[PDB]
Amino acid sequence: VVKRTMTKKFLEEAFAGESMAHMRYLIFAEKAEQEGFPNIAKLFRAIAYAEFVHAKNHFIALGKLGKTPENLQMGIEGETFEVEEMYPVYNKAAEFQGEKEAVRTTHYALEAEKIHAELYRKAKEKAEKGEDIEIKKVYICPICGYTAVDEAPEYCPVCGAPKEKFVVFE
Amino acid sequence: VVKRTMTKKFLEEAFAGESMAHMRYLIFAEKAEQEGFPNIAKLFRAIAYAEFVHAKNHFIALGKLGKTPENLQMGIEGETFEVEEMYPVYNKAAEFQGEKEAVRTTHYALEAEKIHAELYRKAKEKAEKGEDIEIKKVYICPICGYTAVDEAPEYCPVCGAPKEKFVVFE
Numbered sequence: 001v002v003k004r005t006m007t008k009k010f011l012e013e014a015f016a017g018e019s020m021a022h023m024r025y026l027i028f029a030e031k032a033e034q035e036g037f038p039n040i041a042k043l044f045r046a047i048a049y050a051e052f053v054h055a056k057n058h059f060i061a062l063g064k065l066g067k068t069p070e071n072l073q074m075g076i077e078g079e080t081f082e083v084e085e086m087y088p089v090y091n092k093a094a095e096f097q098g099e100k101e102a103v104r105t106t107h108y109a110l111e112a113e114k115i116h117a118e119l120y121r122k123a124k125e126k127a128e129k130g131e132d133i134e135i136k137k138v139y140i141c142p143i144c145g146y147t148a149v150d151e152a153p154e155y156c157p158v159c160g161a162p163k164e165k166f167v168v169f170e
Numbered sequence: 171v172v173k174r175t176m177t178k179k180f181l182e183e184a185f186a187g188e189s190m191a192h193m194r195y196l197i198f199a200e201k202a203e204q205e206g207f208p209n210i211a212k213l214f215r216a217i218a219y220a221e222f223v224h225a226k227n228h229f230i231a232l233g234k235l236g237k238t239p240e241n242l243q244m245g246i247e248g249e250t251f252e253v254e255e256m257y258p259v260y261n262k263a264a265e266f267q268g269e270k271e272a273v274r275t276t277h278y279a280l281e282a283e284k285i286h287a288e289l290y291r292k293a294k295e296k297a298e299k300g301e302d303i304e305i306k307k308v309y310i311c312p313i314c315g316y317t318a319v320d321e322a323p324e325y326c327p328v329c330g331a332p333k334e335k336f337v338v339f340e
């Protein structure tokens with residue numbers, strides 16, 4: 001595990017850097033597909049996986065990967081900071097600054113993070129007792145990121161998108 | 171498209187935070203499966219996808235998504251900063267501070283990014299004049315992120331991994 005302050009900071013910044021690049025590339029891949037360059041889309045996804053490899057290495061070298069229950073606790077904390085602190089403030093500044101599109105994306109994010117904290121809380125009870133959770137499927141709204149386990153409403157309660165548009169993990 | 175300095179800076183931070191959360195959840199997913207929690211892994215992956223939705227929204231609201239050629243150009247500039255500036259320096263700091271794991275992960279990242287810039291450079295050329303790239307397969311080393319198109323090397327020149335460990339994108 002990395003312990004020297006500067007090196008740790010540098011690897012933290014690299015982890016952030018690799019995460020952003022991975023994310024940029026997945027967004028770019030989707031755009032490339034829409035423009036009819038499926039092979040370039042494949043190129044972006046594959047390189048995104050390389051960035052994931054790099055980020056995972058940095059993440060592990062910094063000692064931030066533990067067991068599933070602790071990982072879930074890190075999730076609960078991150079989500080809670082976003083719900084309670086970050087997004088309410090960013091949302092309010094956006095509104096105060098008349099930036100309507102930023103008011104939208106922060107509101108989309110905020111409502112979904114609320115759900116994530118609770119799901120992770122519920123899964124941690126299970127993991128800590130050595131039990132996997134019992135779930136059939138997860139629905140994600142591809143517009144606002146609204147998240148439902150097993151059953152979802154016919155329309156996204158945040159953005160109004162129809163259930164048929166939801167992304168299903170099963 | 172967000173113009174106010176504060177809101178923009180906040181969205182940029184939120185995009186960074188969303189990218190890292192997505193990355194963390196993908197790392198946690200892989201760990202949850204290894205520990206025998208396939209459903210928790212499924213929950214990690216699904217939520218990671220929701221973070222992708224939030225980051226894409228912030229990214230688009232920031233005006234950062236263009237057409238494939240200009241997306242490739244932004245990729246090229248990012249890769250070039252990593253290759254020439256960030257990782258040589260982080261690698262040298264890690265070595266100077268005696269952090270051998272960090273020396274390793276920065277070396278791993280470094281060697282792989284050199285390949286990335288060149289491929290995006292090649293793909294941009296094609297994409298500018300309306301062509302998709304020609305190329306069936308991309309190969310990625312799951313240990314160091316080494317990248318090879320069409321044909322895997324007999325072993326990874328960076329980490330030494332057998333041809334057969336490479337992840338295929340086809």
Ligand SMILES: [Zn+2]
Pocket residue numbers: 018050051054279283
């Ligand atoms: Zn990288």
Ligand SMILES: [Zn+2]
Pocket residue numbers: 079112113116191217221
């Ligand atoms: Zn979340």
Ligand SMILES: [Zn+2]
Pocket residue numbers: 141142143144145146156157158159160161
């Ligand atoms: Zn929605």
Ligand SMILES: [Zn+2]
Pocket residue numbers: 109112113188220221224
């Ligand atoms: Zn989010």
Ligand SMILES: [Zn+2]
Pocket residue numbers: 021051249282283286
């Ligand atoms: Zn790269």
Ligand SMILES: [Zn+2]
Pocket residue numbers: 311312313314315316326327328329330331
């Ligand atoms: Zn390798």
